[PDB]
Design an enzyme around this catalytic site. Structure first.
Site: not given
Ligand SMILES: CC(C)C[C@H](NC(=O)[C@@H](NC(=O)[C@@H](N)CNC(=O)c1nnn[nH]1)C(C)C)C(=O)NC[C@](O)(CCc1ccccc1)C(=O)Nc1cccc(C(=O)O)c1
Length: 365
Positions: A35, A220
Protein backbone atom coordinates in the site's frame (compact mmCIF):
# COMPACT_ATOMS: atom_id res chain seq x y z
CA UNK A 1 19.06 -9.65 -7.57
CA UNK A 2 16.02 -8.48 -9.50
CA UNK A 3 15.08 -11.82 -11.20
CA UNK A 4 14.12 -13.35 -7.81
CA UNK A 5 11.67 -10.53 -7.23
CA UNK A 6 9.77 -10.65 -10.54
CA UNK A 7 6.16 -11.86 -10.13
CA UNK A 8 6.33 -11.76 -6.31
CA UNK A 9 2.82 -10.31 -5.99
CA UNK A 10 -0.59 -12.06 -6.04
CA UNK A 11 -4.26 -11.01 -5.80
CA UNK A 12 -8.00 -11.36 -6.33
CA UNK A 13 -9.39 -8.59 -8.65
CA UNK A 14 -10.38 -5.48 -6.65
CA UNK A 15 -8.96 -6.75 -3.35
CA UNK A 16 -5.32 -5.76 -3.53
CA UNK A 17 -1.86 -7.05 -4.19
CA UNK A 18 0.20 -8.78 -1.50
CA UNK A 19 3.72 -10.04 -1.05
CA UNK A 20 4.90 -12.96 1.15
CA UNK A 21 6.78 -11.63 4.15
CA UNK A 22 7.93 -13.27 7.35
CA UNK A 23 7.95 -11.83 10.84
CA UNK A 24 9.72 -12.84 14.03
CA UNK A 25 11.80 -15.69 15.42
CA UNK A 26 11.30 -18.23 14.18
CA UNK A 27 9.77 -16.53 11.04
CA UNK A 28 5.99 -16.48 10.71
CA UNK A 29 4.81 -16.39 7.11
CA UNK A 30 2.21 -13.77 6.23
CA UNK A 31 0.61 -12.29 3.15
CA UNK A 32 0.93 -8.50 3.32
CA UNK A 33 -1.05 -6.03 1.19
CA UNK A 34 1.24 -3.61 -0.59
CA UNK A 35 0.00 0.00 0.00
CA UNK A 36 1.40 3.32 -1.34
CA UNK A 37 -1.49 5.25 0.16
CA UNK A 38 -0.51 4.68 3.84
CA UNK A 39 2.55 4.24 6.07
CA UNK A 40 1.99 1.73 8.84
CA UNK A 41 3.22 -1.83 8.82
CA UNK A 42 0.40 -3.78 10.48
CA UNK A 43 -0.59 -7.46 10.75
CA UNK A 44 -3.55 -9.39 12.16
CA UNK A 45 -2.47 -10.62 15.63
CA UNK A 46 -5.77 -12.08 16.71
CA UNK A 47 -8.42 -14.55 15.42
CA UNK A 48 -10.80 -13.03 12.91
CA UNK A 49 -13.33 -14.91 10.81
CA UNK A 50 -11.59 -13.65 7.61
CA UNK A 51 -8.03 -14.53 8.71
CA UNK A 52 -6.57 -17.97 7.89
CA UNK A 53 -3.40 -17.02 9.73
CA UNK A 54 -2.15 -14.28 12.03
CA UNK A 55 0.84 -12.90 13.97
CA UNK A 56 1.61 -14.67 17.27
CA UNK A 57 3.91 -12.33 19.18
CA UNK A 58 4.19 -14.75 22.05
CA UNK A 59 5.77 -17.30 19.69
CA UNK A 60 8.51 -14.88 18.72
CA UNK A 61 11.69 -14.41 20.70
CA UNK A 62 12.58 -11.10 18.98
CA UNK A 63 9.27 -9.32 19.65
CA UNK A 64 9.66 -6.15 21.80
CA UNK A 65 6.58 -4.32 23.10
CA UNK A 66 6.30 -0.54 22.77
CA UNK A 67 3.46 -0.38 25.36
CA UNK A 68 1.53 2.00 23.15
CA UNK A 69 -1.72 1.74 21.22
CA UNK A 70 -2.66 2.99 17.77
CA UNK A 71 -5.67 3.64 15.63
CA UNK A 72 -5.53 3.85 11.79
CA UNK A 73 -8.46 4.74 9.50
CA UNK A 74 -8.54 4.13 5.70
CA UNK A 75 -10.87 4.94 2.83
CA UNK A 76 -12.49 1.57 3.55
CA UNK A 77 -11.95 0.07 6.94
CA UNK A 78 -10.12 0.88 10.11
CA UNK A 79 -8.27 -1.01 12.81
CA UNK A 80 -6.51 -0.53 16.12
CA UNK A 81 -3.82 -2.49 17.92
CA UNK A 82 -0.51 -2.58 19.78
CA UNK A 83 2.73 -1.20 18.50
CA UNK A 84 5.80 -3.32 18.90
CA UNK A 85 8.92 -3.98 16.92
CA UNK A 86 10.15 -7.26 15.43
CA UNK A 87 12.53 -8.84 12.86
CA UNK A 88 11.11 -8.80 9.32
CA UNK A 89 12.17 -10.29 6.00
CA UNK A 90 10.90 -10.64 2.41
CA UNK A 91 11.44 -14.17 0.94
CA UNK A 92 11.23 -12.98 -2.72
CA UNK A 93 12.66 -9.56 -2.11
CA UNK A 94 16.10 -8.43 -1.19
CA UNK A 95 18.15 -10.87 0.91
CA UNK A 96 18.03 -9.04 4.29
CA UNK A 97 16.45 -8.94 7.79
CA UNK A 98 15.33 -5.64 9.40
CA UNK A 99 14.02 -4.63 12.78
CA UNK A 100 10.77 -2.82 11.98
CA UNK A 101 7.77 -1.29 13.77
CA UNK A 102 4.75 -3.54 13.75
CA UNK A 103 1.15 -2.94 14.67
CA UNK A 104 -0.46 -6.05 16.06
CA UNK A 105 -4.08 -5.59 14.95
CA UNK A 106 -6.55 -6.57 17.71
CA UNK A 107 -9.77 -4.87 16.55
CA UNK A 108 -10.91 -4.01 13.03
CA UNK A 109 -14.00 -2.79 11.15
CA UNK A 110 -14.46 -3.56 7.40
CA UNK A 111 -10.69 -3.91 7.01
CA UNK A 112 -10.11 -7.60 6.37
CA UNK A 113 -11.75 -8.86 3.18
CA UNK A 114 -13.36 -12.27 3.04
CA UNK A 115 -11.34 -14.58 0.80
CA UNK A 116 -8.70 -11.90 0.12
CA UNK A 117 -5.88 -14.13 1.38
CA UNK A 118 -3.69 -11.29 2.75
CA UNK A 119 -3.38 -10.86 6.50
CA UNK A 120 -1.66 -7.48 6.87
CA UNK A 121 -0.69 -4.13 5.30
CA UNK A 122 2.65 -2.68 4.29
CA UNK A 123 2.32 1.14 4.02
CA UNK A 124 4.95 2.39 1.62
CA UNK A 125 4.57 6.12 2.01
CA UNK A 126 6.30 8.52 4.39
CA UNK A 127 6.57 9.19 8.11
CA UNK A 128 4.29 12.27 7.99
CA UNK A 129 1.06 10.24 7.49
CA UNK A 130 2.13 7.48 9.82
CA UNK A 131 -0.05 6.90 12.90
CA UNK A 132 0.06 7.69 15.82
CA UNK A 133 2.54 10.34 14.61
CA UNK A 134 5.50 10.88 12.31
CA UNK A 135 8.05 9.44 14.80
CA UNK A 136 6.96 5.87 14.08
CA UNK A 137 9.42 5.22 11.26
CA UNK A 138 7.76 3.29 8.36
CA UNK A 139 9.02 -0.09 7.12
CA UNK A 140 10.67 1.26 4.00
CA UNK A 141 12.63 3.84 5.92
CA UNK A 142 13.94 1.22 8.38
CA UNK A 143 14.97 -1.00 5.47
CA UNK A 144 16.91 1.82 3.84
CA UNK A 145 18.48 2.86 7.11
CA UNK A 146 19.55 -0.64 8.22
CA UNK A 147 20.81 -2.16 4.92
CA UNK A 148 22.12 -1.11 1.55
CA UNK A 149 18.87 -1.39 -0.39
CA UNK A 150 18.79 1.83 -2.49
CA UNK A 151 16.01 4.24 -1.70
CA UNK A 152 13.50 3.35 -4.43
CA UNK A 153 11.05 0.62 -5.47
CA UNK A 154 8.86 -0.25 -8.46
CA UNK A 155 5.40 -1.65 -8.81
CA UNK A 156 4.35 -3.62 -11.82
CA UNK A 157 0.79 -4.77 -11.29
CA UNK A 158 -1.03 -7.02 -13.71
CA UNK A 159 -4.66 -7.95 -14.26
CA UNK A 160 -6.22 -11.42 -14.75
CA UNK A 161 -5.63 -14.86 -10.68
CA UNK A 162 -4.06 -11.36 -10.18
CA UNK A 163 -0.19 -10.91 -10.19
CA UNK A 164 2.84 -8.66 -10.56
CA UNK A 165 6.20 -7.49 -9.26
CA UNK A 166 7.53 -5.34 -6.46
CA UNK A 167 11.11 -4.56 -7.32
CA UNK A 168 12.45 -3.34 -4.04
CA UNK A 169 15.75 -1.45 -4.40
CA UNK A 170 15.68 -0.68 -8.11
CA UNK A 171 14.29 -0.88 -11.63
CA UNK A 172 14.15 -4.06 -13.71
CA UNK A 173 14.58 -2.90 -17.27
CA UNK A 174 12.96 -6.02 -18.74
CA UNK A 175 9.54 -5.34 -17.28
CA UNK A 176 8.73 -2.27 -19.33
CA UNK A 177 9.20 -0.82 -22.82
CA UNK A 178 9.95 2.66 -24.15
CA UNK A 179 11.20 5.38 -21.84
CA UNK A 180 10.28 6.02 -18.21
CA UNK A 181 8.51 9.44 -17.73
CA UNK A 182 8.81 11.15 -14.34
CA UNK A 183 6.60 13.44 -12.23
CA UNK A 184 7.68 15.34 -9.08
CA UNK A 185 6.47 13.97 -5.76
CA UNK A 186 5.15 17.42 -4.73
CA UNK A 187 5.62 16.68 -1.00
CA UNK A 188 6.71 13.68 1.00
CA UNK A 189 3.67 12.50 2.83
CA UNK A 190 1.45 10.70 0.33
CA UNK A 191 2.92 10.07 -3.07
CA UNK A 192 1.51 13.45 -4.06
CA UNK A 193 1.44 14.38 -7.75
CA UNK A 194 -0.11 17.15 -9.86
CA UNK A 195 -2.45 16.43 -12.77
CA UNK A 196 -2.46 19.27 -15.29
CA UNK A 197 -4.88 18.22 -18.08
CA UNK A 198 -7.46 15.48 -18.64
CA UNK A 199 -8.61 14.28 -22.00
CA UNK A 200 -11.43 11.95 -22.93
CA UNK A 201 -11.12 10.39 -26.40
CA UNK A 202 -8.80 13.28 -27.40
CA UNK A 203 -11.03 16.04 -25.90
CA UNK A 204 -9.93 18.36 -23.15
CA UNK A 205 -12.36 18.48 -20.30
CA UNK A 206 -12.06 22.32 -20.26
CA UNK A 207 -11.92 22.67 -16.47
CA UNK A 208 -9.45 24.74 -14.43
CA UNK A 209 -6.68 22.34 -13.37
CA UNK A 210 -6.98 23.36 -9.72
CA UNK A 211 -10.10 21.19 -9.94
CA UNK A 212 -8.20 17.94 -10.66
CA UNK A 213 -6.10 18.32 -7.58
CA UNK A 214 -8.82 19.63 -5.31
CA UNK A 215 -7.00 18.94 -2.07
CA UNK A 216 -4.27 16.45 -3.12
CA UNK A 217 -3.82 13.95 -5.88
CA UNK A 218 -2.02 10.77 -4.91
CA UNK A 219 -0.87 7.43 -6.26
CA UNK A 220 -2.64 4.90 -3.99
CA UNK A 221 -2.02 1.23 -4.88
CA UNK A 222 -4.25 0.15 -1.92
CA UNK A 223 -7.39 1.51 -3.54
CA UNK A 224 -9.07 -0.09 -6.51
CA UNK A 225 -10.62 2.83 -8.34
CA UNK A 226 -9.70 5.95 -10.28
CA UNK A 227 -11.30 8.53 -7.98
CA UNK A 228 -12.01 12.01 -9.30
CA UNK A 229 -13.30 15.11 -7.45
CA UNK A 230 -17.08 15.73 -7.82
CA UNK A 231 -16.85 18.41 -10.52
CA UNK A 232 -14.34 16.32 -12.60
CA UNK A 233 -16.13 13.07 -11.77
CA UNK A 234 -19.42 14.57 -13.14
CA UNK A 235 -17.73 15.85 -16.33
CA UNK A 236 -16.02 12.45 -16.90
CA UNK A 237 -19.20 10.41 -16.61
CA UNK A 238 -21.12 12.77 -18.87
CA UNK A 239 -18.37 12.18 -21.50
CA UNK A 240 -18.30 8.43 -20.93
CA UNK A 241 -22.11 8.19 -21.08
CA UNK A 242 -22.15 10.12 -24.39
CA UNK A 243 -19.36 8.07 -25.96
CA UNK A 244 -21.34 4.89 -25.08
CA UNK A 245 -25.01 6.19 -25.34
CA UNK A 246 -25.27 3.49 -28.01
CA UNK A 247 -25.96 1.02 -25.06
CA UNK A 248 -26.76 2.84 -10.95
CA UNK A 249 -23.94 1.15 -12.82
CA UNK A 250 -22.36 4.61 -13.14
CA UNK A 251 -22.19 4.78 -9.36
CA UNK A 252 -20.25 1.51 -9.14
CA UNK A 253 -22.98 -0.33 -7.21
CA UNK A 254 -24.01 -2.92 -9.88
CA UNK A 255 -22.32 -5.00 -12.63
CA UNK A 256 -23.01 -5.05 -16.37
CA UNK A 257 -22.75 -8.22 -18.41
CA UNK A 258 -22.24 -9.35 -21.97
CA UNK A 259 -22.18 -12.75 -23.67
CA UNK A 260 -18.60 -14.08 -23.35
CA UNK A 261 -16.22 -12.28 -25.76
CA UNK A 262 -18.63 -9.58 -27.14
CA UNK A 263 -17.70 -6.78 -24.77
CA UNK A 264 -18.18 -3.65 -26.85
CA UNK A 265 -14.74 -2.32 -25.92
CA UNK A 266 -14.76 0.10 -28.86
CA UNK A 267 -17.66 2.25 -27.47
CA UNK A 268 -15.86 3.17 -24.29
CA UNK A 269 -13.41 6.07 -24.49
CA UNK A 270 -9.76 6.33 -23.53
CA UNK A 271 -8.87 8.67 -20.69
CA UNK A 272 -5.61 10.64 -20.74
CA UNK A 273 -4.02 11.99 -17.62
CA UNK A 274 -1.31 14.59 -18.12
CA UNK A 275 1.11 14.72 -15.22
CA UNK A 276 3.56 17.50 -14.38
CA UNK A 277 7.05 16.75 -15.77
CA UNK A 278 10.63 17.37 -14.71
CA UNK A 279 11.35 20.48 -16.73
CA UNK A 280 9.70 23.89 -16.94
CA UNK A 281 6.37 23.96 -18.85
CA UNK A 282 6.72 20.29 -19.56
CA UNK A 283 4.28 17.40 -19.03
CA UNK A 284 3.67 13.80 -20.23
CA UNK A 285 0.49 11.67 -20.41
CA UNK A 286 -0.69 8.19 -19.52
CA UNK A 287 -3.56 6.83 -21.50
CA UNK A 288 -5.92 4.38 -19.91
CA UNK A 289 -8.15 1.96 -21.82
CA UNK A 290 -11.69 0.79 -21.00
CA UNK A 291 -10.12 -2.52 -20.05
CA UNK A 292 -8.63 -0.89 -17.01
CA UNK A 293 -11.51 1.18 -15.71
CA UNK A 294 -14.06 -1.56 -16.38
CA UNK A 295 -13.09 -4.13 -13.76
CA UNK A 296 -13.53 -7.85 -14.55
CA UNK A 297 -15.86 -9.27 -11.94
CA UNK A 298 -20.80 -14.17 -19.45
CA UNK A 299 -18.01 -11.60 -18.97
CA UNK A 300 -19.03 -9.08 -16.23
CA UNK A 301 -17.70 -5.69 -15.12
CA UNK A 302 -17.87 -3.01 -12.48
CA UNK A 303 -17.37 0.69 -13.35
CA UNK A 304 -14.03 1.51 -11.64
CA UNK A 305 -14.27 5.30 -11.61
CA UNK A 306 -15.94 6.73 -8.51
CA UNK A 307 -16.34 10.10 -6.77
CA UNK A 308 -13.50 11.22 -4.52
CA UNK A 309 -13.50 13.29 -1.32
CA UNK A 310 -9.96 14.40 -2.07
CA UNK A 311 -8.26 15.10 -5.38
CA UNK A 312 -7.55 12.59 -8.07
CA UNK A 313 -6.60 9.17 -6.75
CA UNK A 314 -4.74 6.80 -9.03
CA UNK A 315 -5.64 3.38 -7.64
CA UNK A 316 -4.70 -0.19 -8.50
CA UNK A 317 -6.66 0.06 -11.72
CA UNK A 318 -4.66 2.95 -13.24
CA UNK A 319 -1.34 1.30 -12.20
CA UNK A 320 -2.26 -1.99 -13.89
CA UNK A 321 -0.32 -2.16 -17.20
CA UNK A 322 2.11 0.52 -16.08
CA UNK A 323 5.52 0.08 -14.52
CA UNK A 324 5.57 2.74 -11.75
CA UNK A 325 8.86 3.81 -10.17
CA UNK A 326 8.82 5.29 -6.66
CA UNK A 327 12.11 7.16 -6.87
CA UNK A 328 12.14 8.47 -3.25
CA UNK A 329 15.86 9.06 -3.67
CA UNK A 330 15.19 11.78 -6.30
CA UNK A 331 11.67 12.71 -5.25
CA UNK A 332 9.91 11.41 -8.31
CA UNK A 333 7.47 8.79 -9.59
CA UNK A 334 8.17 7.14 -12.95
CA UNK A 335 5.71 5.81 -15.51
CA UNK A 336 6.14 3.37 -18.42
CA UNK A 337 3.87 0.81 -20.15
CA UNK A 338 4.92 -2.58 -18.78
CA UNK A 339 5.41 -5.98 -20.34
CA UNK A 340 2.05 -7.07 -18.91
CA UNK A 341 0.30 -4.19 -20.73
CA UNK A 342 -3.42 -3.88 -21.63
CA UNK A 343 -4.54 -5.52 -24.94
CA UNK A 344 -7.05 -3.87 -27.29
CA UNK A 345 -7.73 -4.65 -30.90
CA UNK A 346 -7.20 -1.07 -32.17
CA UNK A 347 -5.71 1.12 -29.38
CA UNK A 348 -2.76 0.95 -26.91
CA UNK A 349 -2.29 2.24 -23.40
CA UNK A 350 0.72 4.58 -23.66
CA UNK A 351 3.09 6.94 -21.81
CA UNK A 352 3.84 9.71 -24.24
CA UNK A 353 5.90 12.88 -23.83
CA UNK A 354 7.05 15.55 -24.05
CA UNK A 355 4.13 17.92 -23.93
CA UNK A 356 4.25 21.63 -23.25
CA UNK A 357 1.88 23.03 -20.56
CA UNK A 358 1.86 26.62 -19.25
CA UNK A 359 1.16 27.66 -15.68
CA UNK A 360 1.40 24.19 -14.17
CA UNK A 361 2.09 25.74 -10.79
CA UNK A 362 -1.48 27.08 -10.77
CA UNK A 363 -2.88 23.52 -10.60
CA UNK A 364 -1.53 22.90 -7.09
CA UNK A 365 -3.92 23.38 -4.16
C1 LIG B 1 -10.74 7.71 6.12
C2 LIG B 1 -9.40 8.19 5.59
C3 LIG B 1 -9.57 9.01 4.31
C4 LIG B 1 -8.67 8.97 6.68
C5 LIG B 1 -7.23 9.25 6.29
N1 LIG B 1 -6.57 7.93 6.21
C6 LIG B 1 -5.59 7.75 5.32
O1 LIG B 1 -5.24 8.64 4.57
C7 LIG B 1 -4.93 6.41 5.22
N2 LIG B 1 -4.66 6.12 3.83
C8 LIG B 1 -5.61 5.85 3.04
O2 LIG B 1 -6.79 5.75 3.38
C9 LIG B 1 -5.30 5.56 1.61
N3 LIG B 1 -6.44 4.89 1.04
C10 LIG B 1 -4.89 6.76 0.75
N4 LIG B 1 -5.60 7.99 1.09
C11 LIG B 1 -6.83 8.33 0.75
O3 LIG B 1 -7.61 7.64 0.13
C12 LIG B 1 -7.32 9.64 1.19
N5 LIG B 1 -6.61 10.56 1.87
N6 LIG B 1 -7.43 11.67 2.08
N7 LIG B 1 -8.60 11.39 1.55
N8 LIG B 1 -8.55 10.11 0.96
C13 LIG B 1 -3.61 6.40 5.98
C14 LIG B 1 -2.66 7.54 5.58
C15 LIG B 1 -3.90 6.43 7.48
C16 LIG B 1 -6.58 10.06 7.35
O4 LIG B 1 -5.83 9.51 8.14
N9 LIG B 1 -6.87 11.36 7.37
C17 LIG B 1 -6.42 12.37 8.34
C18 LIG B 1 -7.71 12.86 9.01
O5 LIG B 1 -8.35 13.69 8.06
C19 LIG B 1 -7.49 13.69 10.28
C20 LIG B 1 -8.71 14.07 11.13
C21 LIG B 1 -8.25 14.95 12.28
C22 LIG B 1 -9.06 16.02 12.74
C23 LIG B 1 -8.62 16.84 13.80
C24 LIG B 1 -7.37 16.62 14.41
C25 LIG B 1 -6.55 15.57 13.96
C26 LIG B 1 -6.99 14.75 12.90
C27 LIG B 1 -8.70 11.77 9.32
O6 LIG B 1 -8.44 10.91 10.14
N10 LIG B 1 -9.86 11.84 8.69
C28 LIG B 1 -10.89 11.00 8.88
C29 LIG B 1 -12.04 11.22 8.09
C30 LIG B 1 -13.15 10.37 8.16
C31 LIG B 1 -13.11 9.27 9.04
C32 LIG B 1 -11.96 9.06 9.82
C33 LIG B 1 -11.95 7.90 10.78
O7 LIG B 1 -11.08 7.88 11.72
O8 LIG B 1 -12.81 6.99 10.63
C34 LIG B 1 -10.84 9.92 9.76
Amino acid sequence: SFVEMVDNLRGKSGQGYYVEMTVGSPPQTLNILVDTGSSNFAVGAAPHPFLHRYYQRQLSSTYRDLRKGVYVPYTQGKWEGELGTDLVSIPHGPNVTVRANIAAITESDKFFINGSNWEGILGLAYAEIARPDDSLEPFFDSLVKQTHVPNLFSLQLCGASVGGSMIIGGIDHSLYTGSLWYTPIRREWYYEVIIVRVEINGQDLKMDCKEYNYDKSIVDSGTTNLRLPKKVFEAAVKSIKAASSTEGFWLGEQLVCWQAGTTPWNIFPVISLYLMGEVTNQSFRITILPQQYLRPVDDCYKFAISQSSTGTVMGAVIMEGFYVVFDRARKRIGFAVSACHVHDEFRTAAVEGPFVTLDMEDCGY
